[PDB]
TrEMBL record, chain B:
Organism of this sequence: Legionella pneumophila
Superkingdom classification of source: Bacteria
Protein name, per record: Uncharacterized protein
Top-level taxonomy: Bacteria, Pseudomonadati, Pseudomonadota, Gammaproteobacteria, Legionellales
Length: 375, 106
């Protein structure tokens, strides 16, 4: 089959079967590199053979990366070729609209690849009330609110002092109201605050409201997750589908994504249902909703309901940036076949499991050799 | 062919870059009052690709100088289609990225 859908089926099957070997990195340089970053772990007395062997046994070197950006780069290279991927990666992102319509309109019925950068809003969470004569932006804690005698300012992550537009009377009322010594250097957003408690708690709440309102027009966005979405054209009567592809930093690999079938499970939502969830991630003002959607779309398979709870509840606003480019199935299928031929030539076996084991054996022998040499 | 060659090469060089970042990031945690390490990293980031003299008695991590001097001796399984000069440019680019991040520029 020469369709985009067959491209999807093939890349999924190959990553499922071969994991890290889809990078085309030969086993020997993988093992030598692993030795070079593992020499310090080798116990330095005893007999060398089994110390080296022990570090080689606990090496994770054939386990695939869990970098989201690296997985996205791998998908882009395979489906577009290296030059096309580089051009796509340098191209501009667009911010997903509230209803996701600009992405929808960017998905004509051709074979398309979407790349997504998720951003979180890295707003200040702390303030200090301080006399102006003691406020030094060169040494004060950055990404923080500062309340002076008659001024309210934001020291941003770059160390720039940004005025928050409040009047002298507003700021002085705030400064004078916040007298408790423990609240001179404190958190901005207190779940349990209440202004009917006292003028002080009134002022702390009001300052939080002012800062939150002003922050909406300040660029605190910072990138936080990366993934891709393959949207083959519909070449049969079946409804068109999309397939998200990801790794998640420190959490799971692309191979685990496919082997848990999460690409397919999410494809069941349909193009519109998936985009609706993605857009709601950027519009919702409820942290339980934000958390639940984030887990549904982005957790390792099976962790959807525990990914974003407790410490990991998604309290900050998120936004979705996207870019789209056309996939040529002739190119992608040729690229994937070349990876397959490399694997079959250099790591032969009767099935993929045996080929993976041969790759691991060759890497471990290379690592043993390199470690013995350096020691 | 043509795709696989370039794709493999770029992924191997990314692997080496990851190793460079791990080793240099750890090494930078223990600089001195004169910023000896940082300064040597900054010098490396703009280094003449034909230079070797600096590596004779350098504060740089041993893996970095070994990879710079003779990458195909440091890792003798490295494909010969990865040139010494490609490795040296990779080392320079990595040093530049790390240096700007470390000095809170980026």
């Amino acid at each position: 089959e020469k369709t985009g859908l067959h491209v999807h089926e093939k890349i999924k099957h190959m990553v499922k079967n071969y994991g890290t070997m889809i990078t085309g990195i030969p086993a020997e340089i993988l093992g030598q590199n692993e030795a070079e970053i593992s020499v310090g772990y080798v116990k330095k007395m005893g007999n060398m053979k089994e110390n080296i062997a022990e570090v080689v046994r606990k090496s994770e070197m054939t386990q695939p990366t869990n970098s989201a950006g690296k997985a996205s780069n791998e998908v882009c290279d395979l489906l577009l070729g290296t030059e096309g991927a580089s051009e796509f990666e340098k191209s501009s992102y667009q911010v997903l609209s509230g209803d996701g319509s600009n992405l929808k309109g960017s998905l004509p019925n051709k074979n398309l690849l979407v790349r997504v950068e998720m951003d979180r809003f890295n707003a200040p969470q702390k303030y200090q009330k301080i006399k102006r004569e003691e406020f030094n932006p060169e040494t004060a804690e950055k990404n923080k609110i500062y309340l002076l005698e008659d001024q309210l300012v934001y020291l941003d992550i770059f160390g720039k002092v940004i005025d928050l537009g409040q009047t002298s009377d507003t700021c002085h009322r705030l400064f004078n109201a916040i007298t408790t010594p423990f609240y001179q250097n404190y958190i901005l957003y207190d779940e349990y605050i209440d202004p009917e408690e006292s003028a002080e708690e009134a002022a702390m709440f009001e300052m939080g409201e002012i800062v939150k309102a002003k922050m909406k027009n300040i660029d605190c966005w910072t990138a936080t997750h990366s993934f891709t979405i393959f949207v083959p054209e519909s070449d049969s009567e079946d409804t068109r589908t999309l397939y998200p592809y990801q790794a998640y930093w420190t959490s799971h690999t692309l191979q685990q994504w496919f082997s848990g079938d999460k690409d397919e499970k999410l494809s069941r939502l349909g193009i519109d249902g998936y985009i609706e969830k993605l857009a709601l991630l950027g519009t919702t003002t409820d942290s339980k909703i934000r958390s639940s959607i984030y887990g549904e779309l982005f957790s390792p398979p099976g962790k959807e309901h525990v990914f974003c709870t407790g410490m990991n509840e998604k309290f900050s606003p998120l936004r979705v940036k996207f870019k789209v480019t056309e996939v040529n199935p002739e190119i992608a299928l040729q690229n994937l076949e070349e990876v397959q031929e490399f694997i079959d030539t250099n790591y032969p076996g009767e099935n993929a499991k045996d080929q993976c084991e041969l790759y691991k054996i060759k890497a471990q022998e290379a690592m043993t050799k390199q470690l013995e040499m350096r020691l | 062919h043509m795709f696989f060659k370039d794709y493999q090469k770029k992924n191997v060089m990314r692997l080496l870059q990851d190793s460079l970042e791990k080793i240099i990031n750890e090494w930078l945690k223990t600089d001195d009052e004169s910023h000896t390490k940082l300064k040597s990293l900054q010098e490396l980031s703009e280094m003449d690709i034909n230079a070797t003299s600096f590596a004779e008695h350098s504060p740089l991590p041993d893996f970095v100088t070994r990879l710079w001097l003779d990458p195909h001796k440091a890792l003798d399984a490295m494909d010969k289609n990865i040139s010494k000069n490609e490795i040296r440019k990779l080392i320079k680019e990595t040093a530049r990225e790390i240096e700007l991040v470390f000095t809170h520029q980026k």
